[PDB]
Amino acid sequence: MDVSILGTGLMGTALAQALIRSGTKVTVWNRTADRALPLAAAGATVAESPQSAIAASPLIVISLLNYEIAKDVVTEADSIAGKIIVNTATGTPEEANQFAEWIAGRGARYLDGAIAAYPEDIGTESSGINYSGDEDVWEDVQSLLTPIAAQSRYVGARPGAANVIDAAMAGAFFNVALGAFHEAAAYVRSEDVAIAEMRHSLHLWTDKLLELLHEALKAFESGEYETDQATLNVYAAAVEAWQQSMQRAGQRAALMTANLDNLQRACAAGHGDKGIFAQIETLSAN
Amino acid sequence: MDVSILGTGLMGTALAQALIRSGTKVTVWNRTADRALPLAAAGATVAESPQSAIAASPLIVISLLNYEIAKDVVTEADSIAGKIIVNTATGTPEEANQFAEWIAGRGARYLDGAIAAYPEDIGTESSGINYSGDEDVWEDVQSLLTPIAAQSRYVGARPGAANVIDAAMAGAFFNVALGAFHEAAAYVRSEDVAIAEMRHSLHLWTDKLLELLHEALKAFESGEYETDQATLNVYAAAVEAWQQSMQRAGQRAALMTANLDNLQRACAAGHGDKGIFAQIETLSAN
Ligand SMILES: Nc1ncnc2c1ncn2[C@@H]1O[C@H](COP(=O)(O)OP(=O)(O)O)[C@@H](O)[C@H]1OP(=O)(O)O
Ligand SMILES: Nc1ncnc2c1ncn2[C@@H]1O[C@H](COP(=O)(O)OP(=O)(O)O)[C@@H](O)[C@H]1OP(=O)(O)O
């Protein structure tokens, strides 16, 4: 099954190159189009227009900045009836649900994607894509698309599920954890200790974190938050002492302050004697 | 060189077992002492008293709850002159600096340690210990102690350096990042998406985080925060949109809120067009 890609940015380009290597015939389009020139040389067909790119293939993969631009570009096709549209842009769950419904009312099939991978990672081990929406669609494009990522997974029937997980993992987890590390290193530097002496431990701490994340998920699935060892109360106390150390050292320590606040509410609602994972129970706004 | 361990808790016990396996003669003491019974069977000598345990060995490794208890126990020796004292308790840098000075005034040598490893990890790959204080001491105990952790490192002349790095990595980074993951999963669940569909990506995200941490450290060492790709401004905007999504979904999102605040201050102080690592520059209380 041939495919066309709308968007030859870094990601779009990477998608196109992986698909060529798969042995798939690829047509590309891009709003500028100088950008798509090199892809021509690798085996791709450059199209004059979205309409023309859409018409060329049964499967259209979108890699454009956002959902609004995606909508505007695919509006320029007169017909998409019978086509499979796969939109790999990041965005809100609502964006996905609405895009899905618009696609469906034009007589096209839809699947929504979210890419956890730098462009340069796209053909390799260090690359995953989550997909959500109609499972029948996923079944029809799995073999064609699974090549372009090591770990490709259908994560739910809701069009917006991939976008929810991507926000959660890239935003709520990853970006915040990256910030936490800035607070950490700024703290070390404030105590006149060499930031370099953090370096050799990094992999030990990210390994430990991975094992803990697995364990937190098991506990969130279970409702089993029971002791083991350090309780919420112990953690709350330890975090307060860390916060005070960081402040005495001249750091605002805002993430550490927010963490303490999460821990206290968990304790203050009677979970003080359960394990740290029980902190999940008071993250809601109530 | 024989060693005595004060404290046969889980950690103390683990230290003792590794040292026996090293081929070192070990004497142990513990305040209760039923606890130390099994260690007898593995090859260790149980001592009646701290004084007696101290007298038995040139090198004393402390694994007691905190610095206060450590001080009180070693006060019970009449003499420690000429002994090497290695205190592996976690605590503040000030605790370390003061303990160091007290040890020195009793005519003993000192090194301070911080253990990044669960007890069960102590003899294995997944285990590191940082040491700080007098480098001459480290040189004299390196071969004897390096066995009991895969990655053992001297991290500075300040007695308190190991305690600073441990607070930074265990507290400011790790505990907060673990909290961030609770916010993430609570968010996914709030959007009626299966928390299970986070699981398969975990290792990809902790791998990506590790590479990013390395890169942040390189940038903190350099002062080179320059573009590349996504700027502080883009991040601030993306984080606001994540925060709004999480709140609309009924989550407090306190860590995400604190992260945004860090990002805005960086932008609001004219770093908006540099890369994310420039956020380090406004973490101070000012
Ligand atoms: N307003 C718009 N209309 C149509 N396509 C747009 C667009 N804004 C961005 N794109 C496309 O969306 C894709 C995303 O590009 P980007 O600037 O976000 O980064 P990158 O090139 O790294 O992917 C590109 O294919 C881009 O095409 P251009 O080369 O014409 O910029
Ligand atoms: N007040 C105190 N005086 C002396 N030793 C103490 C102490 N509190 C704790 N310890 C020791 O400090 C060590 C830390 O024990 P812990 O209760 O913190 O956890 P774990 O047993 O997992 O290491 C133990 O060797 C403990 O000895 P006990 O078996 O007598 O509890």
Domain boundary among the residues A163, A184, A209 is at: A163
Residue at A149 is within a domain: yes
Q: Is-contact A231 A272, C-beta < 8 A? A: yes
For residue A219, is it within any domain? no
- Co-location of B46 and B138 in the same domain: yes
CA angle B279, B282, B283 (to 5 degrees): 90
Same domain for A153 and A65: yes
Task: Test B258 with A255 for CB contact under 8 angstroms.
Answer: yes
Quote the minimal CA–CA distance from A219 to chain B in Å: 11
The rounded Cα A72 to chain-centroid distance in angstroms is 24
Looking at the structure, tell me whether residues A153 and A229 fall in a common domain: no
Q: Which helix (H) or strand (E) holds A216?
A: helix A202-221
B286: its two tokens:
């000012």
Substitution site in B31, B69, B71 for ligand 2 pocket (most atoms within 8 Å of beta carbon): B31
Together in a domain, B147 and B211: no
Tokens 């968010």 sit on residue: B187
Q: Report the CATH number that the domain containing residue A254 is assigned in CATH.
A: 1.10.1040.10
Residues A242 and A112 grouped into a single domain: no
B283–A212 CB contact, under 8 Å: no
**Local structure of B80: helix, strand or coil:** coil
Strand partners, A284: B251
Instruction: Give the closest of B180, B204, B212 to A126, CB-based.
Output: B204
B178 to A105, B9, B231, B252: CA distances (angstroms): 43, 26, 26, 16
Distance CA B264, CA B247 (A): 19
Q: Looking at the structure, do residues A109 and A235 belong to the same domain, yes or no? A: no
- Which alpha helices (DSSP H) does B36-81 contain, by range? 37-42, 50-56, 67-75
- Which residue range forms the structural domain that includes residue B188? 164-282
CATH code at position A96: 3.40.50.720
Query: Does the distance separating the beta carbons of A256 and B262 come in below 8 Å?
Result: no
Q: What is the resolution of this structure in A?
A: 2.0
Nearest to A258 among B151, B173, B255 (CB): B255
Same domain, B115 and B56: yes
Task: Please report whether residue A208 resides in a domain.
Answer: no
- Determine whether B40 is exposed, middle or buried from the number of CB atoms within 10 Å of its CB (0-12, 13-18, 19+): exposed
User: A276: which 2 tokens?
Assistant: 């740290």
Assess whether A142 and A245 both reside in one domain. no
Domain end, chosen from B158, B185, B206, is at B158
Residue A94 domain-assigned?
yes
E-strand ranges in chain A read 3-6, 26-29, 45-46, 59-62, 84-87, 109-116, 128-133, 151-154
A281 within 8 A of A271, measured Cβ to Cβ:
yes
- B131 and B27 co-located in one domain: yes
B150, B169: one domain: no
Question: What is the distance in A from the centroid of ligand 2 to the CA of B65?
Answer: 5
Residue B119, ligand 2, Cβ within 6 A: no
Q: Whats the size of chain A, residue-wise?
A: 286
Q: Give how many domains chain A has, as a whole number.
A: 2
B196 and B87 within one domain: no
Rounded to whole angstroms, the Cα distance separating A177 from A165 reads 16
Task: Choose one of B158, B182, B212: the last residue of a domain.
Answer: B158
Radius of gyration of chain A (CA): 23
Say if residue B152 is in the same domain as residue B11. Answer: yes
Calculate ∠ Cα B213-B219-B225, nearest 5°.
Answer: 120
| CB distance A185 to B217 below 8 Å | yes
- Give the closest ligand to the alpha carbon of residue B6: 2
β-strand partners of A119: none
Per the CB < 8 Å rule, is A206 touching B213? yes
DSSP B25: -
Pocket test for ligand 1, best of A11, A39, A65 (most atoms within 8 A of CB): A65
